[PDB]
Amino acid sequence: LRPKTLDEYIGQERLKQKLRVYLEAAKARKEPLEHLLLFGPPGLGKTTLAHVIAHELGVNLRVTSGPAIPGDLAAILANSLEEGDILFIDEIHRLSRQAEEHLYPAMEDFVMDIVIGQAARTIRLELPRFTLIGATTRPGLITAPLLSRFGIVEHLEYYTPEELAQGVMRDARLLGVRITEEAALEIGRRSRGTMRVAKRLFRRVRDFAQVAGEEVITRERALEALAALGLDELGLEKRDREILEVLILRFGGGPVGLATLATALSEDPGTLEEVHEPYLIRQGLLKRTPRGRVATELAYRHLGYPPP
Amino acid sequence: RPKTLDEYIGQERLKQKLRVYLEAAKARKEPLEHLLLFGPPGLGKTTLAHVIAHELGVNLRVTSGPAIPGDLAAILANSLEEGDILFIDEIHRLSRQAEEHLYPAMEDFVMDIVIGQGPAARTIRLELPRFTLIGATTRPGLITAPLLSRFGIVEHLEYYTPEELAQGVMRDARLLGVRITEEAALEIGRRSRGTMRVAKRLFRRVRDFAQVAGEEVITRERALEALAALGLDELGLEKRDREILEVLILRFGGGPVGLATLATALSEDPGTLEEVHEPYLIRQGLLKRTPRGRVATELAYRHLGYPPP
Numbered sequence: 001l002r003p004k005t006l007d008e009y010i011g012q013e014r015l016k017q018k019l020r021v022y023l024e025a026a027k028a029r030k031e032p033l034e035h036l037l038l039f040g041p042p043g044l045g046k047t048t049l050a051h052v053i054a055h056e057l058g059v060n061l062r063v064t065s066g067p068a069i070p071g072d073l074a075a076i077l078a079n080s081l082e083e084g085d086i087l088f089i090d091e092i093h094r095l096s097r098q099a100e101e102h103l104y105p106a107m108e109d110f111v112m113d114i115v116i117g118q119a120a121r122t123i124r125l126e127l128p129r130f131t132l133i134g135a136t137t138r139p140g141l142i143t144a145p146l147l148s149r150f151g152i153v154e155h156l157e158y159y160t161p162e163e164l165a166q167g168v169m170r171d172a173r174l175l176g177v178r179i180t181e182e183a184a185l186e187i188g189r190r191s192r193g194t195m196r197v198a199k200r201l202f203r204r205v206r207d208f209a210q211v212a213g214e215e216v217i218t219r220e221r222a223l224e225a226l227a228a229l230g231l232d233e234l235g236l237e238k239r240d241r242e243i244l245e246v247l248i249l250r251f252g253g254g255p256v257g258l259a260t261l262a263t264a265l266s267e268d269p270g271t272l273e274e275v276h277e278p279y280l281i282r283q284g285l286l287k288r289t290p291r292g293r294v295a296t297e298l299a300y301r302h303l304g305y306p307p308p
Numbered sequence: 309r310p311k312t313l314d315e316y317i318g319q320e321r322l323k324q325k326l327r328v329y330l331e332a333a334k335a336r337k338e339p340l341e342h343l344l345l346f347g348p349p350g351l352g353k354t355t356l357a358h359v360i361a362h363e364l365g366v367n368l369r370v371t372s373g374p375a376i377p378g379d380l381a382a383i384l385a386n387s388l389e390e391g392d393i394l395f396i397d398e399i400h401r402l403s404r405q406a407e408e409h410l411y412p413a414m415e416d417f418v419m420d421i422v423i424g425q426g427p428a429a430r431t432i433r434l435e436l437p438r439f440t441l442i443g444a445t446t447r448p449g450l451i452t453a454p455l456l457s458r459f460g461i462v463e464h465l466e467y468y469t470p471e472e473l474a475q476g477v478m479r480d481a482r483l484l485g486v487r488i489t490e491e492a493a494l495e496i497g498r499r500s501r502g503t504m505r506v507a508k509r510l511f512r513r514v515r516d517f518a519q520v521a522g523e524e525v526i527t528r529e530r531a532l533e534a535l536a537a538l539g540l541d542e543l544g545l546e547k548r549d550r551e552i553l554e555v556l557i558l559r560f561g562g563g564p565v566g567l568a569t570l571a572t573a574l575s576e577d578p579g580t581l582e583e584v585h586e587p588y589l590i591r592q593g594l595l596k597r598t599p600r601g602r603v604a605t606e607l608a609y610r611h612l613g614y615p616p617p
């Protein structure tokens with residue numbers, strides 16, 4: 001399922017325009033690529049990009065997690081790491097302050113130290129040249145000392161609906177399910193600009209279409225399945241629709257107030273503060289005015305209300 | 309507790325060279341070389357260590373083998389001055405971890421100390437004052453070759469004589485205020501097994517008998533009846549050792565017997581027979597340990613008044 005070429009990678013055009021240059025230069029100079037840091041929201045394809053980079057350079061790759069790592073970091077750098085090989089570390093911001101300090105000598109001078117057994121004298125290993133790739137959601141999650149050893153720093157942006165449609169069609173042709181292009185476009189539009197969301201949504205749609213016995217997933221069947229899942233034309237869930245309703249019909253675009261936030265939902269200020277608001281702000285239907293949160297005209301028109 | 313080397317009772321052969329070594333060490337204003345004292349238990353090596361320390365005019369640091377690994381550093385760095393004396397009684401009981409921390413302090417006077425403690429931390433080498441270490445072991449076999457290699461002077465403690473034991477008995481009687489004659493103390497020392505503890509115990513028992521008898525002075529004869537009532541020969545064997553020899557000679561013909569059969573005949577524990585009564589039956593020429601059993605020598609026949617084989 002994972003692509004093995006920058007050409008097969010779907011929709012990170014701006015990032016690829018420079019990644020191709022850097023990889024071409026590194027290959028021409030016959031030396032390992034400089035350490036790379038990938039930003040961007042989850043689900044966009046960072047691990048796939050790491051695998052694509054390794055395949056482009058023709059070298060082995062050793063994905064490991066952030067909180068997976070003491071001396072075990074040197075254990076995994078010493079045995080399986082030959083001349084330059086991508087070492088992907090997902091969630092680089094979660095490193096403890098015990099191996100992060102050990103990363104700097106290893107990724108600057110390629111030397112590591114291990115002490116155990118008492119003797120217990122320091123043993124310094126001449127690590128082979130290698131490239132490290134790290135992934136984190138935001139620039140501010142990692143410390144400034146860590147955002148200095150990375151030669152290349154790149155950002156990863158949300159996919160457009162067309163690119164998600166192409167990915168859904170590729171998944172369908174790989175699995176062996178025939179789908180019309182318009183159904184894939186609708187599925188991509190309902191996806192919140194995320195690849196794995198589109199994958200899961202297509203899997204659910206094909207699950208709903210298999211029981212009906214339809215051989216081709218038509219646009220009408222896709223729309224019915226998406227409505228059954230509880231998604232509108234903008235991809236908002238039922239929780240988003242109901243919070244928008246209880247804002248617009250109870251305050252008329254004014255501040256919601258902390259007291260009334262849990263009154264109409266009977267829920268703690270949990271997912272409301274981190275799972276619901278970010279997408280509503282991203283879609284542009286909610287604006288954080290200093291006086292209070294204001295539902296824009298997009299909310300009024302989207303919720304089936306007459307124009308003001 | 310003797311203080312000077314002239315007050316020590318009966319280590320004449322050792323004292324003769326000890327005087328020379330101590331005088332040579334004092335003349336050079338240099339600490340004595342490390343000393344190791346061999347000898348069977350019960351001969352007073354700690355008293356000799358105290359006498360040596362007093363003669364050198366230096367304080368003590370007395371410690372046994374099984375005392376507490378890291379306490380060696382504590383005892384070496386706490387109360388050791390220039391030329392201080394450390395006496396490790398039963399030095400063959402030191403653990404290997406504690407053994408491989410002392411010879412650096414014997415050949416170079418540098419000790420590595422664990423400073424961080426707790427988890428696996430680092431160590432620092434610390435300099436110590438020059439000192440002399442006296443070791444005392446009854447089992448030379450368990451002393452490894454490296455440990456024996458660092459000892460400059462090695463000497464042996466030998467068994468006392470009836471006269472030195474008599475002198476010890478006289479000293480104890482004088483301390484306790486009991487009047488005893490020279491020949492009585494000589495008899496008590498003769499019936500001892502060349503050991504000071506045994507001589508003192510015999511003297512105390514004879515004192516009990518004489519005091520119960522209401523006698524103000526212990527003479528030769530009173531000691532003789534006291535030791536006869538104690539069941540003792542002219543050589544120091546109790547009734548049990550004579551019984552062992554008589555059973556070995558009469559019941560089994562003196563030939564090889566074995567521990568189990570002899571112990572069954574005597575109604576005694578085989579380990580008790582082997583580890584309590586036999587070692588003094590040997591060392592007197594009264595018994596042998598053949599691979600086929602235990603044999604009685606001709607000295608056993610002569611001692612018991614039996615015809616020779």
Ligand SMILES: Nc1ncnc2c1ncn2[C@@H]1O[C@H](COP(=O)(O)OP(=O)(O)OP(O)(O)=S)[C@@H](O)[C@H]1O
Nearest residue numbers: 309310316317318348349350351352353354355504
């Ligand atoms: N030669 C001696 N002169 C005077 N007192 C002695 C002598 N030997 C031992 N003692 C006394 O014995 C007591 C100390 O015990 P010791 O018999 O010296 O220990 P030890 O010689 O090491 O015997 P073992 O076999 O090691 S238990 C003190 O009361 C000393 O006065």
Ligand SMILES: Nc1ncnc2c1ncn2[C@@H]1O[C@H](COP(=O)(O)OP(=O)(O)O)[C@@H](O)[C@H]1O
Nearest residue numbers: 001002009010042043044045046047048195196
């Ligand atoms: N551009 C792309 N083209 C094809 N498949 C993709 C692309 N981006 C992501 N995928 C799919 O998504 C999966 C990896 O996404 P994921 O691991 O969720 O991203 P992240 O590592 O940021 O969490 C892969 O199985 C891959 O098939």
Ligand SMILES: [Mg+2]
Nearest residue numbers: 348349350446
């Ligand atoms: Mg002893």
